Design a protein around this ligand. Structure first.
Ligand SMILES: CCCCCCCCCCCCCCCCCCCC(=O)O[C@H](COC(=O)CCCCCCCCCCCCCC)COP(=O)(O)OCCN
Ligand SMILES: CCCCCCCCCCCCCCCCCCCC(=O)O[C@H](COC(=O)CCCCCCCCCCCCCC)COP(=O)(O)OCCN
Ligand SMILES: CCCCCCCC/C=C\CCCCCCCC(=O)OC[C@H](CO)OC(=O)CCCCCCCCCCCCCCC
Ligand SMILES: CCCCCCCC/C=C\CCCCCCCC(=O)OC[C@H](CO)OC(=O)CCCCCCCCCCCCCCC
Ligand SMILES: CC(C)CCC[C@@H](C)[C@H]1CC[C@H]2[C@@H]3CC=C4C[C@@H](OC(=O)CCC(=O)O)CC[C@]4(C)[C@H]3CC[C@]12C
Ligand SMILES: CC(C)CCC[C@@H](C)[C@H]1CC[C@H]2[C@@H]3CC=C4C[C@@H](OC(=O)CCC(=O)O)CC[C@]4(C)[C@H]3CC[C@]12C
Ligand SMILES: [Ca+2]
Ligand SMILES: [Ca+2]
Ligand SMILES: [Zn+2]
Ligand SMILES: [Zn+2]
Lengths: 686, 36, 686
């Protein structure tokens, strides 16, 4: 058997106190009034007595929402400590009004002295009523608290190194973290933002960015900070969604401290705000500035207009140069024509790079330093225009914004490759005069290095077209999922690189004694790139290349065979190669497939919002006047606004509050309490 | 203190229930009719 | 603009009728009583008047559960047609009692004549009250209906070809299908099975099997028949789960018309009934008959006992032959020892087949008809024992049960291969005397065919070990998922075979003019199995083999090259081969991966139940005394039960009814109706 006993002493309640608490629970007003009137004369019952569950008479009155029993218990001067917190958490407007309004009148002789009721508090001691009201998100209680001149402490910077923050973190880290989380939860409520901020959209944007940065910093409390940032973003999108006219939307978007607020939302990564349907409609109307009814048309006329405007690339840019104020020069300033002209210019550059690799132009390959062909002479202005455009993009916008795009790394690499190939071509022209045949050239010839860099730059230029997939409505979310899965591929390739380095080290350490010279082997070649596969594990670089090529099956099985009949070493190397093949083809690749599969399922729900955000970021890049000319031609030589914004935000806040007001065992207990209180009063009167 | 806080938290966090409300209304209805 | 009008004429209700219906809706008893008393004298209001939503006064009384207004409307002789159906659907016991009990007394002068109320009925005209009560699953209403001598029509056989079923199907198929579905829904309710069947478990088993067969037959109504079968199976498992003692469980399982009811459940495919935990505990206790506390032991002693009992295979079977009544001979009759001895015998047969393929035994391969080696002489009794065991399994149990296992096809194939190789060996011994060298043997030599059939039989014997995976606790659900994915692989391989046949036909039709002889080609070989790959598309069989081998990449690219310089035909064939490769390696295989992935997710939730069902089917195969000896040694030459079952089913039905009784806007409308009726009566009295 096992004896059981109450380990921790809870004092038993007396018969009178238990009857009084039961009468308060059942809502019988007359019995509670009789007990309260008998309490002073006889001192029989401690009115501030607790229960087994930690509630007092006042808390039981608050939980049942009996305003009559609540005011009756208040009239006999019961203990009132922390009851306002329970009323605020219960979201009872009348209880909060009673507790606010009754604490002032009729206070005489301090309070009656009471001891040992104060240990048990459900609410934390750091909590204050305005902060808990902000956490509850109730509007009326927040309004009534804000009317009584109440303030909230200001949180410090995340990278704060002052004496008091460091001392509070060292003395009690848990209290500091709980206080900061409670303060940010109070500041992130939609009701407090609507009531105590003159700019709710900008305040919600800044609070969402700060909460996201705090979630990035604080590892322990990441989830609730992410939830707070999502709540602020959804509050901003819901406030934007309450508009009723196009003038209100253009007033909200164009308010400054042209579309300044949209740029501020994009800078703070508010994808829900940017991807709202009305803002998308306004951006579509601005995008198709000179082409009304673009969505109406059948696709053949749209494609014919696109072909006729893309084939007209060399005109309409010189027209802008010669007459910007003319009717023809003004058509290039629209964003759609700008994007189509840039796409046509890049397609022309790609087609010219295809045409440069033909035998019609390339002649007399046996020259050491060859002069540039006419195709290269014409391609050179496009490279210079790309260089001028990239340096102009570096200057305008700042160096701190140029690096956040992540497409500029390929542009920097392409420009470096073009500069390197141009320098190699000019040095080969200047000091490599001659006509030596190509079969006896140096391996480190700058002409060959220049051509290799030109080929790599041509590959980068052709792979630059992936960034235009946001313009279409079908290839955007595909590349968004591709971008997430590329990060997952990098996370896989770290472990793959570690395993490859380990197996390459083992194979090279086993096999590097049996290295043979190129003269002894057939055809005077040495490596895995021969007709007969030579020594593949003779060096660390050759071992790494051989282990890389074994994944695609291009490495044969006889590379592990040596000249001598060392059967044990050959068997050990074959076991090594087989273990590496089993790992890299049975565990790792299938695990990568499983990881990118799981990622896609998560990515798909959000795929549209981020696609619309990327398309909005691409659309507003062409809105400005900086960069009107193409790459081939870019190198050729006020308080009424604030008042209207306040009016629109006022109407939006009222509509959002109406919408949120329009949109459990505690509830039924109210109905039992209301029926029980009515039953006792009917029996008492009758 | 942790046990007291956890008990408060767990206390803070169906057709039988409505039957109570029908029973409470029915018992009050019979007693009002009986008294009157 | 668009005009809108009431297209279909609903007659407007008068002021008195609308006021009367509103008073009935609000539950005011006195106003309804006054209107009913004034109705006869003045004829002002049609008491059977309808509303805009199709309810009458009596239906409004039934829906609000106002028994007083219900009986008051009954006392004035209102129309009562189909109100019992609404009461049964509303599951009101008092309303059903009132409608049953009031229809008999005080019927005078027929009914008062009423016209044109009878068109609108929510319940279908084929419905009857007992059938709708069975659909509702309420117990009290079903009991009250069954007490009044009520019957249900019997459904016909699914393969029924009588005149009346065919005539009803031809005249009105929809009415017949609805009537059959309503009858089977009425018969599948747990309450009706508990109340009107002396054997609820067997009745639930038969109804579940009939509903599953009807779902297999009727294509249109598959889902609700599957739901009814699942409901019957869950009712059977829930009734089995209500037991309280081991004696009740053994009484239920061992009841006959040893474990007869378990065999009946397995025959009807009741996986939930078999996989219940108490039945699994009883089967585990019977399975470990002579080894008490098997689950208790550390795994080393369990594996040591398994090794010592599996290595003792040649004893304990001859002991059963020589002394079945001895203490040593009785240990083989237990099921665990039987399974371990059979596994040890099959492992010994597999090890002997491995030992037969060694150079220690095989000598003098240059004999045309070779005598059987001593290993073959010893292997022959195992093949004869397998033949005798398979034919004994064919005889006992019936030919109709031998084919449903699906493992007997491999046993039939293995026996056919062993018979063919034995016949080829004996014919080669009898009439192929000589010692001709193997290099000049006929291609159709029976020795080579016998060895090929022996190798295929050895592969089948080694692959027969997959069936023992149910015994382990980790390899069972894996092979269950493998069994489902094998069916999905067959569904894929149909489309793959069609695509392979199409591309093979095209490739053979293109390439069969360029066939070359074996003498002209190097090494005197012709086919894809040479060192240099010969003509791969010269014949239909060779084209099929080449297209099969291209999936694994073992077919090179130079097979599409011909001797002459027909560049167009070579390019067309290369395009054909590339299109087949792109299909069979980019679309089909990845689609097969996606299909078997989806299937696994569905399979996993149910994987255990079916694994426990398969393990129970394997365990009871060894319970009987038929087949005690191993394959090497099998060829060596009462009404108290029914009363106890009725008692146990009685207690189980009572416990299940208590459990199901223990386990929306209509409800709140009751509370509004009860509060409104009490409010009017208090105002009327006061
Ligand atoms: C001697 C060796 C010779 C080698 C020769 C061959 C070299 C081949 C190189 C091939 C490189 C292929 C790169 C393909 C990138 C595809 C990216 C698709 C996804 C995508 O849109 O990514 C964007 C970023 O791209 C990026 O950030 C792309 C970065 C590319 C870097 C390339 C250089 C390294 C997203 O856009 P976002 O980052 O704005 O999205 C912010 C969202 N919140
Ligand atoms: C000249 C050509 C020479 C060719 C030489 C090579 C031949 C190689 C043949 C290889 C065959 C491999 C077969 C593997 C089968 C694995 C099955 C795993 C799943 C499984 O347990 O299936 C059971 C049925 O198996 C079955 O039904 C298995 C059927 C096997 C048939 C084999 C012959 C065709 C289920 O058991 P269950 O059906 O009782 O489950 C009833 C549930 N409700
Ligand atoms: C992180 C990555 C590692 C994770 C942990 C390990 C995962 C499993 C690694 C298995 C390695 C097996 C190496 C076998 C070997 O030596 O083969 C070459 C050698 C070549 O001689 O193989 C042998 O000598 C044995 C021949 C039989 C091999 C049976 C392999 C069974 C498992 C196959 C898995 C699928 C392929
Ligand atoms: C049901 C199964 C069919 C479903 C419907 C069709 C699915 C897609 C079929 C695509 C067939 C492409 C055949 C290409 C071809 O002729 O190649 C051989 C020939 C060989 O000469 O290829 C060519 O001549 C063209 C060389 C470029 C090929 C580009 C292929 C792009 C698509 C690649 C997909 C992934 C691989
Ligand atoms: C398929 C093979 C032959 C390679 C083709 C390479 C390029 C010629 C393709 C790759 C991506 C294509 C682009 C993808 C998306 C678009 C957007 C499309 O416009 C829209 O989707 C309308 C809405 C809008 O963008 O405002 C116009 C064509 C264009 C620039 C495409 C032009 C042709 C591009 C550059
Ligand atoms: C891994 C390589 C070396 C191939 C091994 C082939 C066989 C020697 C294996 C394959 C399946 C194995 C069986 C899988 C499962 C079981 C059940 C296991 O017993 C249980 O799981 C206990 C519960 C019960 O079955 O009652 C005893 C061993 C046995 C027969 C195994 C014996 C060894 C087997 C026949
Ligand atoms: Ca750039
Ligand atoms: Ca069998
Ligand atoms: Zn600080
Ligand atoms: Zn019939």
């Amino acid at each position: 058997r096992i004896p059981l006993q109450i380990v921790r002493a809870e004092t038993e309640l007396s018969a009178e106190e238990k009857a009084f608490l039961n009468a308060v629970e059942k809502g019988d007003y007359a019995t509670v009034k009789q007990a309260l009137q008998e309490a002073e004369i006889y001192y029989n019952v401690n009115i501030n007595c607790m229960d087994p569950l930690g509630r007092s008479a006042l808390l039981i009155a608050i939980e049942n929402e009996n305003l009559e029993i609540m005011e009756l218990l208040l009239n006999h001067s019961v203990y009132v400590g922390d009851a306002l917190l329970y009323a605020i958490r219960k979201e009872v407007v009348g209880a909060v009004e009673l507790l606010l309004s009754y604490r002032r009148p009729s206070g005489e002789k301090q309070v009656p002295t009471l001891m040992m009721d104060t240990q048990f508090s459900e609410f934390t001691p750091d909590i204050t009523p305005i902060m808990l009201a902000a956490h509850t998100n109730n509007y009326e209680i927040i309004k009534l608290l804000v009317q009584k001149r109440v303030t909230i402490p200001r949180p410090h910077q995340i990278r704060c190194n002052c004496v008091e923050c460091v001392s509070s973190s060292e003395v009690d880290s848990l209290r500091h973290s709980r206080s900061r989380l409670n303060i940010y939860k109070a500041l992130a409520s939609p009701s407090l933002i609507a009531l105590s901020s003159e700019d709710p959209i900008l305040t919600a944007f800044r609070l969402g960015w700060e909460l996201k940065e705090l979630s990035k910093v604080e590892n322990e409390f990441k989830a609730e900070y992410e939830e707070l940032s999502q709540q602020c973003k959804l509050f901003a999108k819901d406030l934007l969604d309450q508009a009723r006219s196009s003038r209100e939307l253009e007033i909200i978007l164009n308010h400054r401290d042209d579309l300044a607020k949209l740029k501020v939302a994009i800078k703070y990564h508010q994808k829900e705000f940017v991807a709202q349907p009305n803002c998308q409609q306004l951006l579509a109307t601005l995008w198709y500035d000179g082409f009304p009814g673009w969505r109406r048309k059948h696709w053949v006329v749209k494609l014919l207009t696109c072909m006729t405007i893309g084939f007209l690339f060399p005109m309409l840019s010189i027209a802008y140069l010669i007459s910007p104020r003319s009717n023809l020069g003004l058509f290039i300033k629209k964003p759609f024509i700008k994007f189509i002209c840039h796409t046509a210019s890049y397609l022309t550059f790609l087609f010219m790079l295809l045409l440069a690799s033909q035998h019609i132009v390339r002649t007399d390959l046996h020259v050491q330093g060859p002069p540039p062909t006419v195709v290269e002479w014409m391609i050179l202005p496009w490279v210079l225009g790309f260089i001028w455009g990239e340096i102009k993009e570096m200057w305008d916008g700042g160096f701190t914004e140029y690096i956040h795009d992540w497409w500029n790394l390929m542009d920097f690499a392409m420009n470096s490759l073009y500069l390197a190939t141009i320098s190699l071509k000019i040095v080969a022209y200047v000091k490599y005069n001659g006509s030596r045949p190509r079969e006896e050239w140096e391996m480190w010839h700058p002409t060959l290095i220049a051509e290799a860099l030109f080929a790599i730059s041509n590959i980068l230029s052709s792979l630059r077209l992936i960034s235009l997939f946001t313009a279409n409505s079908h290839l955007g979310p595909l590349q968004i999922s591709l971008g997430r899965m590329l990060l997952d591929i990098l996370k896989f390739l770290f472990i793959y690189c570690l395993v490859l380095l380990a197996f390459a080290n083992g194979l090279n350490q086993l096999y590097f004694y049996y290295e043979t010279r190129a003269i002894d082997e057939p055809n005077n070649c040495k490596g895995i790139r021969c007709e007969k596969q030579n020594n593949a594990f003779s060096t660390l670089f050759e071992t790494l290349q051989s282990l890389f090529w074994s994944v695609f099956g291009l490495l044969n099985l006889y590379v592990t065979n040596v000249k001598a009949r060392h059967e044990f070493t050959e068997f050990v190397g074959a076991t090594m190669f087989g273990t590496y093949n089993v790992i890299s083809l049975v565990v790792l690749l299938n695990m990568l497939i499983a990881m990118m599969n799981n990622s896609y399922q998560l990515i798909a729900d959000h795929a549209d919002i981020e696609w619309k955000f990327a398309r909005t970021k691409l659309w507003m890049s062409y809105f400005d006047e900086g960069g009107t000319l193409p790459p081939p031609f870019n190198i050729i030589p006020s308080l009424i606004q604030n008042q209207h914004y306040q009016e629109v935000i006022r109407n939006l806040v009222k509509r959002y509050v109406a919408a949120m007001i329009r949109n459990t065992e505690e509830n039924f207990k109210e109905l039992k309490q209301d029926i029980s209180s009515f039953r006792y009063e009917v029996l008492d009167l009758l």
